[PDB]
Design a protein around this nucleic acid. Structure first.
Ligand SMILES: [Mg+2]
Ligand SMILES: [Mg+2]
Ligand SMILES: [Mg+2]
Ligand SMILES: [Mg+2]
Ligand SMILES: [Mg+2]
Ligand SMILES: [Mg+2]
Ligand SMILES: [Mg+2]
Ligand SMILES: [Mg+2]
Ligand SMILES: [Mg+2]
Ligand SMILES: [Mg+2]
Ligand SMILES: [Mg+2]
Ligand SMILES: [Mg+2]
Ligand SMILES: [Mg+2]
Ligand SMILES: [Mg+2]
Ligand SMILES: [Mg+2]
Ligand SMILES: [Mg+2]
Ligand SMILES: [Mg+2]
Ligand SMILES: [Mg+2]
Ligand SMILES: [Mg+2]
Ligand SMILES: [Mg+2]
Ligand SMILES: [Mg+2]
Ligand SMILES: [Mg+2]
Ligand SMILES: [Mg+2]
Ligand SMILES: [Mg+2]
Ligand SMILES: [Mg+2]
Ligand SMILES: [Mg+2]
Ligand SMILES: [Mg+2]
Ligand SMILES: [Mg+2]
Ligand SMILES: [Mg+2]
Ligand SMILES: [Mg+2]
Ligand SMILES: [Mg+2]
Ligand SMILES: [Mg+2]
Ligand SMILES: [Mg+2]
Ligand SMILES: [Mg+2]
Ligand SMILES: [Mg+2]
Ligand SMILES: [Mg+2]
Ligand SMILES: [Mg+2]
Ligand SMILES: [Mg+2]
Ligand SMILES: [Mg+2]
Ligand SMILES: [Mg+2]
Ligand SMILES: [Mg+2]
Ligand SMILES: [Mg+2]
Ligand SMILES: [Mg+2]
Ligand SMILES: [Mg+2]
Ligand SMILES: [Mg+2]
Ligand SMILES: [Mg+2]
Ligand SMILES: [Mg+2]
Ligand SMILES: [Mg+2]
Ligand SMILES: [Mg+2]
Ligand SMILES: [Mg+2]
Ligand SMILES: [Mg+2]
Ligand SMILES: [Mg+2]
Ligand SMILES: [Mg+2]
Ligand SMILES: [Mg+2]
Ligand SMILES: [Mg+2]
Ligand SMILES: [Mg+2]
Ligand SMILES: [Mg+2]
Ligand SMILES: [Mg+2]
Ligand SMILES: [Mg+2]
Ligand SMILES: [Mg+2]
Ligand SMILES: [Mg+2]
Ligand SMILES: [Mg+2]
Ligand SMILES: [Mg+2]
Ligand SMILES: [Mg+2]
Ligand SMILES: [Mg+2]
Ligand SMILES: [Mg+2]
Ligand SMILES: [Mg+2]
Ligand SMILES: [Mg+2]
Ligand SMILES: [Mg+2]
Ligand SMILES: [Mg+2]
Ligand SMILES: [Mg+2]
Ligand SMILES: [Mg+2]
Ligand SMILES: [Mg+2]
Ligand SMILES: [Mg+2]
Ligand SMILES: [Mg+2]
Ligand SMILES: [Mg+2]
Ligand SMILES: [Mg+2]
Ligand SMILES: [Mg+2]
Ligand SMILES: [Mg+2]
Ligand SMILES: [Mg+2]
Ligand SMILES: [Mg+2]
Ligand SMILES: [Mg+2]
Ligand SMILES: [Mg+2]
Ligand SMILES: [Mg+2]
Ligand SMILES: [Mg+2]
Ligand SMILES: [Mg+2]
Ligand SMILES: [Mg+2]
Ligand SMILES: [Mg+2]
Ligand SMILES: [Mg+2]
Ligand SMILES: [Mg+2]
Ligand SMILES: [Mg+2]
Ligand SMILES: [Mg+2]
Ligand SMILES: [Mg+2]
Ligand SMILES: [Mg+2]
Ligand SMILES: [Mg+2]
Ligand SMILES: [Mg+2]
Lengths: 136, 205, 118, 122, 59
RNA sequence: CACCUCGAUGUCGGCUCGUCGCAUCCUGGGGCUGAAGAAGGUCCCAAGGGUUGGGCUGUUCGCCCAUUAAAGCGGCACGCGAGCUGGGUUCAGAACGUCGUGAGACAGUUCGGUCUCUAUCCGCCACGGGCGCAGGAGGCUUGAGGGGGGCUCUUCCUAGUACGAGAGGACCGGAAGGGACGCACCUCUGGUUUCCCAGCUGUCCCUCCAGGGGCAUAAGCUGGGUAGCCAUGUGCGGAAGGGAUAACCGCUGAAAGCAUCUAAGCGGGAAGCCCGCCCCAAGAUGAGGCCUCCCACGGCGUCAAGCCGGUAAGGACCCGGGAAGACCACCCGGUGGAUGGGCCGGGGGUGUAAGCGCCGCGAGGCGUUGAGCCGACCGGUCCCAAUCGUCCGAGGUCUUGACC
RNA sequence: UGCGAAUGCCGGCAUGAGUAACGAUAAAGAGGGUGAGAAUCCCUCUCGCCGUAAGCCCAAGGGUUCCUACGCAAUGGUCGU
RNA sequence: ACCGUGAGGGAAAGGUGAAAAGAACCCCGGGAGGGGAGUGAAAUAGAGCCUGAAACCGUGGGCUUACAAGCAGUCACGGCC
């Protein structure tokens, strides 16, 4: 027995070091790349378009426009190749997956996605709190 | 030719060396050898194995406390590892080290009565133009007066799946003696929870 | 193949399969014991065990939820005030299903019994 | 995944705008071209006086695909269009200056001029 | 499709051998826990079915 | 030619599905070359596997585009219409050219024009029932014999070496990537997910409001979507190796003092053959073997086999079920029990319920609240149901040879 | 005046076979009643379908099908009270 | 009768017994049917009634058949009844 508990044992690859976010709010993920036997940390930053929750190997995809072409990247949420991920802004999604933005991509999405104050306000307030409460 | 019984647990991915490595973890528990075969009494060479210790006694009367290590007699004994003559009793997953290649026998998910096209990846009929109720159908099966019959291997629809299947040369990614786990990449046959037997490869041996 | 798939279609499309389970619930809760065919029965259990359990919750929300399927206000009172309490210390299994030895004559159907437990 | 009949955006300045795949050059029978694959194309829409004319049969390499590219590191990328760069038979760009992102798979397939000329490589 | 038709009237031998599986099985019955009569198992008896739960009353 | 078929053997082409032949298109092995190398030419061996996608035409064929290792040729009623098509041909309508005074007519053209749910036998794919396998049982397995499979390219190192004035450019040996095909799998990617959540319109309704139900498809529409089934997704396969051979290359060697691979011998030598791999497999009536069980009752048959009744090991039946499945089978349970259902925990999906408070004239907005709802996935728990039972099942044929 | 054949004629009975099918995919569930017997009849409740109709009225045509009592052999594509 | 708008077409279908003596009454059964009883020279003359053939269906018995393959017979030997 413990069919899932065994496969759930299987991960020493879970990682707690990355931030909370949901679809709709924009983030920036730094990712190890090769680029000809050298090594670089490339950043990729756009709206997170969706999140697939499987526990370990959940994955989340990020969309942005780059030099006049939309791009989506799909990252494994536990990937050993993610150095860090910063949330660069929060936004109010209204539904789980937003693919609908692909056929907007214009000003109409900054109207559809207006920033989520509740989670913004609780970020600052969480950052003031942890800042004040570490030192003294 | 080392081998051990197990059950397919489930799949996941492992991130080894900045690569994904999808893996199928099969649990191969301790395996209490209950018989040996000899060119003397038998005419070939193997071990009976035995697995999944359960039943209190459903075992009833024919049994072996003859080798007596059948203490806590196991549900499935599935046996031959063929030419395998191990160290002592009780083969473990210690048997395999990572980077070892292995073949895996198992029982393919049963599809029951399955069309040609999914049995045999036939083409089927067009979905339009003439059409008329042959979209999923096999076509001609033969010629005319000669031979005036149907070849003895002729691919047709019937029960497909739920059969013996051995996918070969799989890489052992990891082995976890602690919980008796083992990690191979990919193809291994059949449902989670089904029995699999796991042998050294035939690429070299 | 339709492997590890839960729940029966019983020779009727979805909306009729709903109406079936609802109309069996209203009837069972009403008479306390009912005779259907064995498979329609085995499949009624879950439908009402949940309907009952939500009455054990008692909250207005939980009522309104039961009111979606059972739809009749008076029955819901009888569910909430009369029936629900009897199970308060019963965790699960608020229904019994017992097979009858008589085959329905003229379609041949196996019959069973469905009653609220006690 | 590109196949014959597929239209492609032209990601360089040669003067082609749209090309349409006519063959994918991989094997005898390869079914689809992807990022880093060379195809043969007919030039469908082209800007006046270009290096390249409408109707020319040419070779292109595929720098972008609407169908996601999967990487070993477990991740994927996908772009908003399918795009190609028109190339000569020695297989280097016919243009100066490519436009928009290119897939990093190109480097690995040996196209170092185009990845270089590319504004962003993802 | 054209009209497949049987080519030969089948022998009495042959239909009767077709039917070699057609024979019935008697219903499987067990003696009633309380009452005298026979009942197919796992079924509430046509007379006084069970104990703990409330049987259909022939009582 | 006119032999079976005119009380009917459906006719081109396509499609589907192939199977065979080899006079071999490619790949493998070879000899000769007017074979420097690379690349060809020609002929020999070889049928294992492979043998592309388009434009045009009803086309076969052919021509052409773009590729390729190659874009083989034949046969199987010009394979295959109780498998499909119906563009062509090949009824009836209509027109053109042409022929005919005409009615009409044309391997001349044009547009149109009914392709028949139900498989008895053989054959083929699957799956069971019976009996047999001379004592009966529960396991486990040998493999006679079958089947599957069998392709190939680029690049790189060797080495810009050998060879060549140069340009070009090997053998052999090694490495890494592909294509297409196969088997499996669902972690990822990507689909479906008929009621898992949400939103929306019209109407009717419960109960006026709030909230909600029906219907708008066999989901009203829309946005998503677990398991499962899936390919676009992933893993793995072709081998290695062993043997015998083909053409061929040789050794030794006469007949024939020489010579000769051959007449006696022997060694090399193919993607082919036999093994090797994978799958089936003792109805292999030639019914195999191993482990373990139960036992050698009672009567009649005083006897060649038996018979009847309980029995024994064991099975069935019935029931709860199952990534097993058309039914049957197979597998797991059956209270000394976690088998299904319910409940609970988790996963997962939807995306912050209802109620209430506050802001706004209002539509609405905020908070409570990642809320509420929540199939299947991983578990837990005897609350509901797998209760109680019933039936069947050996007591072992003889001859013959070796043991206390 | 003699039958084995005439795709003979008339009748009977087989085979195919317990096979196809049981005639619109608007749809059913339960409780009670009746009766020798009930999925199929009666009554309640719930669910679904029609609503420029699948409701109502008239003309053709049909000719007792009308209402009621008693009744189930057959007719009813099953059953039938 | 039926079929055809019509002219018109156009069938099947005989037999208890000498005599109804046409089976009271009891039993099973809702009836149908049957078992007894009774009638009769006779009731497999019982009204679906003289005789009652054959194909066809069935029950019981004997011989036989699950490693044989065929126009089904025939010739021979052997077994069992
Ligand atoms: Mg667990
Ligand atoms: Mg299945
Ligand atoms: Mg297949
Ligand atoms: Mg298709
Ligand atoms: Mg169709
Ligand atoms: Mg034919
Ligand atoms: Mg033949
Ligand atoms: Mg199922
Ligand atoms: Mg049905
Ligand atoms: Mg509906
Ligand atoms: Mg290059
Ligand atoms: Mg048809
Ligand atoms: Mg058919
Ligand atoms: Mg002739
Ligand atoms: Mg003549
Ligand atoms: Mg003819
Ligand atoms: Mg004929
Ligand atoms: Mg004919
Ligand atoms: Mg040849
Ligand atoms: Mg060659
Ligand atoms: Mg050369
Ligand atoms: Mg040559
Ligand atoms: Mg060949
Ligand atoms: Mg065109
Ligand atoms: Mg055409
Ligand atoms: Mg031509
Ligand atoms: Mg071609
Ligand atoms: Mg051919
Ligand atoms: Mg010909
Ligand atoms: Mg032909
Ligand atoms: Mg046809
Ligand atoms: Mg035919
Ligand atoms: Mg035509
Ligand atoms: Mg005619
Ligand atoms: Mg004229
Ligand atoms: Mg003509
Ligand atoms: Mg003509
Ligand atoms: Mg027309
Ligand atoms: Mg037509
Ligand atoms: Mg035949
Ligand atoms: Mg059998
Ligand atoms: Mg063999
Ligand atoms: Mg073989
Ligand atoms: Mg070099
Ligand atoms: Mg999954
Ligand atoms: Mg998926
Ligand atoms: Mg899913
Ligand atoms: Mg009201
Ligand atoms: Mg309202
Ligand atoms: Mg309504
Ligand atoms: Mg509404
Ligand atoms: Mg309506
Ligand atoms: Mg509807
Ligand atoms: Mg989707
Ligand atoms: Mg030789
Ligand atoms: Mg010599
Ligand atoms: Mg000599
Ligand atoms: Mg010789
Ligand atoms: Mg040799
Ligand atoms: Mg090979
Ligand atoms: Mg086997
Ligand atoms: Mg055997
Ligand atoms: Mg045996
Ligand atoms: Mg089942
Ligand atoms: Mg069992
Ligand atoms: Mg349970
Ligand atoms: Mg969640
Ligand atoms: Mg809110
Ligand atoms: Mg106010
Ligand atoms: Mg939950
Ligand atoms: Mg417990
Ligand atoms: Mg019949
Ligand atoms: Mg049939
Ligand atoms: Mg059928
Ligand atoms: Mg049917
Ligand atoms: Mg009907
Ligand atoms: Mg109907
Ligand atoms: Mg209206
Ligand atoms: Mg009138
Ligand atoms: Mg009339
Ligand atoms: Mg009348
Ligand atoms: Mg009336
Ligand atoms: Mg009446
Ligand atoms: Mg009647
Ligand atoms: Mg009737
Ligand atoms: Mg008349
Ligand atoms: Mg008398
Ligand atoms: Mg009598
Ligand atoms: Mg007589
Ligand atoms: Mg008489
Ligand atoms: Mg007389
Ligand atoms: Mg008579
Ligand atoms: Mg008989
Ligand atoms: Mg034999
Ligand atoms: Mg025999
Ligand atoms: Mg035969």
């Amino acid at each position: 027995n413990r069919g899932a508990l065994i496969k759930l044992v299987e991960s020493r690859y879970v990682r707690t070091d990355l931030p909370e976010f949901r679809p709709g709010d924009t983030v920036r993920v730094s990712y190890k790349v090769k680029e000809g036997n050298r090594t670089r940390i490339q950043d990729f930053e756009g709206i997170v378009i969706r999140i697939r929750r499987n526990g370990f190997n959940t994955t989340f995809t990020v969309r942005k426009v780059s030099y006049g072409v939309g791009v989506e990247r799909i990252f494994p949420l536990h990937s050993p190749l993610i150095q860090k991920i910063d949330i660069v802004q929060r936004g109010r999604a209204r539904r789980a997956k937003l693919y609908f933005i692909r056929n907007l991509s214009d000003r109409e999405i900054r109207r559809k996605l207006r920033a989520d104050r509740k989670r913004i306000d609780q970020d600052r307030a969480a950052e003031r709190a942890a800042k004040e409460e570490a030192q003294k | 030719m080392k081998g051990i019984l197990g059950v397919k647990v489930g799949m996941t991915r492992i991130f080894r060396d900045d690569r994904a490595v999808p893996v199928t973890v099969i649990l191969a528990g301790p395996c209490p050898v209950v018989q040996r075969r000899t060119p003397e009494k038998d005419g070939y060479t193997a071990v009976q194995l035995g697995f999944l210790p359960q039943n209190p006694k459903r075992v009833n009367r024919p049994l072996k406390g003859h080798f007596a290590k059948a203490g806590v007699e196991p549900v499935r004994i599935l046996r031959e590892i063929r030419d395998f003559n191990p160290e002592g009793d009780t083969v473990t997953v210690e048997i395999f080290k990572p980077g070892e290649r292995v073949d895996v026998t198992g029982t393919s998910k049963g599809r029951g009565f399955a069309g040609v096209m999914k049995r045999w990846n036939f083409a089927g009929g067009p979905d339009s133009h003439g059409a008329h109720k042959i979209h999923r159908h096999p076509g001609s099966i033969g010629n005319r007066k000669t031979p005036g019959r149907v070849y003895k291997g002729k691919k047709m629809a019937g029960h497909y799946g739920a059969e013996r299947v051995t996918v070969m040369n799989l890489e052992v990614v990891d082995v976890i003696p602690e919980e008796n786990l083992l990690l191979v990449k990919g193809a291994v046959p059949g449902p989670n929870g089904g029995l699999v037997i796991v042998r050294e490869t035939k690429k070299a041996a | 193949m339709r492997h590890l798939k839960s729940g029966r279609k019983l020779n009727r499309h979805s909306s009729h399969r709903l109406a079936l389970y609802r109309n069996q619930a209203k009837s069972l809760l009403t008479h306390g014991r009912i005779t259907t065919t064995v498979p329609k029965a085995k499949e009624l259990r879950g439908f009402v065990d949940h309907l009952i359990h939500l009455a054990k919750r008692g909250d207005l929300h939980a009522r309104r939820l039961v009111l979606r399927d059972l739809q009749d206000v008076k029955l819901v009172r009888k569910l909430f005030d009369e029936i629900a309490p009897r199970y308060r210390d019963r965790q699960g299994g608020y229904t019994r299903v017992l097979k009858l030895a008589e085959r329905r004559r003229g379609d041949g159907a196996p019959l069973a019994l469905v009653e609220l437990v006690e | 995944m590109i196949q014959p009949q597929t239209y492609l955006e032209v990601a360089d300045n040669t003067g082609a705008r749209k090309i349409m795949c006519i063959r994918v050059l991989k094997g005898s029978n390869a079914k689809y071209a992807t990022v880093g694959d060379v195809i043969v194309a007919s030039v469908k829409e082209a800007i006046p006086r270009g290096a390249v004319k409408e109707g020319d049969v040419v070779k292109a390499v595929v720098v972008r695909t609407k169908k996601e590219i999967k990487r070993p590191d477990g991740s994927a990328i996908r772009f908003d269009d399918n795009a190609a760069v028109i190339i000569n038979n020695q297989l280097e760009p016919r243009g100066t200056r490519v436009f928009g992102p290119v897939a990093r798979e190109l480097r690995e397939k040996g196209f170092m001029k185009i990845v270089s000329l590319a504004p962003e490589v993802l | 499709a054209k009209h497949p038709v049987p080519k030969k009237k089948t022998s009495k031998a042959r239909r009767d051998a077709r039917r070699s599986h057609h024979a019935l099985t008697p219903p499987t019955l067990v003696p009633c826990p309380e009452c005298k009569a026979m009942k197919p198992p796992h079924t509430v008896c046509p007379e006084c079915g069970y104990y703990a739960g409330r049987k259909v009353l022939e009582v």
